[PDB]
Design a protein around this ligand. Structure first.
Ligand SMILES: [Ca+2]
Ligand SMILES: [Ca+2]
Ligand SMILES: [Ca+2]
Ligand SMILES: [Ca+2]
Lengths: 151, 13
């Protein structure tokens, strides 16, 4: 509950509404049957074991249904991912000093130094080279996102 | 690695 304990009362209320779209009988639990109904409304045709698998990913207590606390943990994890994505785009905008969509070595040097980083010139060059998948000498947004993706 | 350096800089931002 450490993740869910980080949510505001307002976020909890939004998420209670989201939970209700799954928990259509209002009994406090999302079942595989309920999930299947939602997935079919999304144009999917899952199997029972697929639904069970989806439940299992969220079902911290192993009881086979999703309660509100488990739902809140899931939503808190999604919020954290959204926040991380936002931090990465905002950092890209700064590192790409001229806004042209590519981080050059010179730009990276400037930003690093202005942030008080003491990286040597070789280290800056290395950072560009490692991230530069396409070989054009600079780092585009998708290259940056890949570089910042956990392992 | 390069990722850690980029990350350390992002935390300064
Ligand atoms: Ca229910
Ligand atoms: Ca459960
Ligand atoms: Ca640029
Ligand atoms: Ca590139």
């Amino acid at each position: 509950n450490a993740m869910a304990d980080q949510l505001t009362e307002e976020q909890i209320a939004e998420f209670k509404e989201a939970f209700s779209l799954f928990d259509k009988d209002g009994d406090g639990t999302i079942t595989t049957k309920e999930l299947g109904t939602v997935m079919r409304s999304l144009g999917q045709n899952p199997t029972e074991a697929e639904l069970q698998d989806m439940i299992n990913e969220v079902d911290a207590d192993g009881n086979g249904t999703i309660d509100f606390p488990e739902f809140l943990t899931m939503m808190a994890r999604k919020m954290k991912d959204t926040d991380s994505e936002e931090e990465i785009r905002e950092a890209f905008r700064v590192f790409d000093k001229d806004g042209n969509g590519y981080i050059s070595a010179a730009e990276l040097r400037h930003v690093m130094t202005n942030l008080g980083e003491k990286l040597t010139d070789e280290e800056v060059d290395e950072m560009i080279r490692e991230a530069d998948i396409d070989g054009d000498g600079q780092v585009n947004y998708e290259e940056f996102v890949q570089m910042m993706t956990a392992k | 690695n390069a990722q850690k350096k980029y990350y350390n800089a992002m935390k300064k931002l």
